[PDB]
Design a binder for this molecule. Structure first.
Ligand SMILES: O=C(O)CCc1cc(-c2ccccc2)n(-c2cccc(C(F)(F)F)c2)n1
Lengths: 13, 239, 13
């Protein structure tokens, strides 16, 4: 599980 | 005579010249980015410094003994509790070690006349800066050293006031152990000043108070439209 | 809660 991809999914626009 | 624990703490410390350079480079490369239209203020610049210093604090924390063993959810709760305290503690220690009275040693590694910052700032911020100054002075007169500094950083990070921790026991364990190591270090290294241990610990409530005031003020500044885009600082402020 | 804090903690250097 790549951390960047999770951030991209989870962050506010 | 430095306890083992304290040696483990010191090994976790960042390379200060490289951190200074990194932030300094970030700020230059930011003007490059920013259009020749959009300008930036002393307050704004200091917000960016705080933001970049936060990245460095999180990095330090994630690699540190004990903190590494926590689950990320616990790591987040600990950092959300103490980020502004760690900023203040880091600032204060720089003033003591690489600074002088009448001057502010910035995290980018230069000194500027206190006057030159304070003059830019209104009364609320001046008030905060003064209290910080007195802390610096108190800790200067205590002969605050790097071994003491790292202990206080761990005591701030591994706070007992943080609710809903999974592994609260590890956190209690770290508090107790760093506490005991600090007690040893002062009695072994400063044996004629039996007050030194107590004087160090009593700075922590003062740091906590100044940090809460800083946050309230910064949130005001943010809601006022005065804080330039600053993802991590404001994410922490929203915690 | 903070996607960003989470990311800064998880990312594999
Ligand atoms: O030189 C530094 O260390 C970087 C900039 C800085 C200075 C302070 C500060 C603020 C009040 C008293 C003492 C130092 N910074 C700071 C510390 C805690 C909280 C905040 C906040 F709330 F504005 F985000 C800023 N950041």
């Amino acid at each position: 599980e790549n951390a960047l991809l999770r951030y991209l999914l989870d962050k506010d626009d | 005579s430095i306890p083992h624990l304290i040696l483990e703490l010191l090994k976790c410390e960042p390379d200060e010249p490289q951190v200074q350079a990194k932030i300094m480079a970030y700020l230059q490369q930011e003007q490059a980015n920013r259009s020749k239209h959009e300008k930036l203020s002393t307050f704004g610049l200091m917000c960016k410094m705080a933001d970049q210093t936060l990245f460095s604090i999180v990095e330090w924390a994630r690699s540190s003994i004990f903190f590494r063993e926590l689950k990320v959810d616990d790591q987040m709760k600990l950092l959300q509790n103490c980020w502004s305290e760690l900023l203040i503690l880091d600032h204060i220690y720089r003033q003591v070690v690489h600074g002088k009275e009448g001057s502010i040693f910035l995290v980018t590694g230069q000194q500027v006349d206190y006057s030159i910052i304070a003059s830019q700032a209104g009364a609320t911020l001046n008030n905060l800066m003064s209290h910080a100054q007195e802390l610096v002075a108190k800790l200067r007169s205590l002969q605050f050293d790097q071994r003491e500094f790292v202990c206080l950083k761990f005591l701030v990070l591994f706070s007992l006031d943080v609710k809903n921790l999974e592994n609260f026991q590890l956190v209690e364990g770290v508090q107790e152990q760093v506490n005991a190591a600090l007690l040893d270090y002062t009695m072994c290294n400063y044996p004629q000043q039996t007050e030194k241990f107590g004087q160090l610990l009593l700075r922590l409530p003062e740091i906590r108070a100044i940090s809460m005031q800083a946050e309230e003020y910064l949130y005001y500044k943010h809601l006022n439209g005065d804080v330039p885009y600053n993802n991590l600082l404001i994410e922490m402020l929203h915690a």
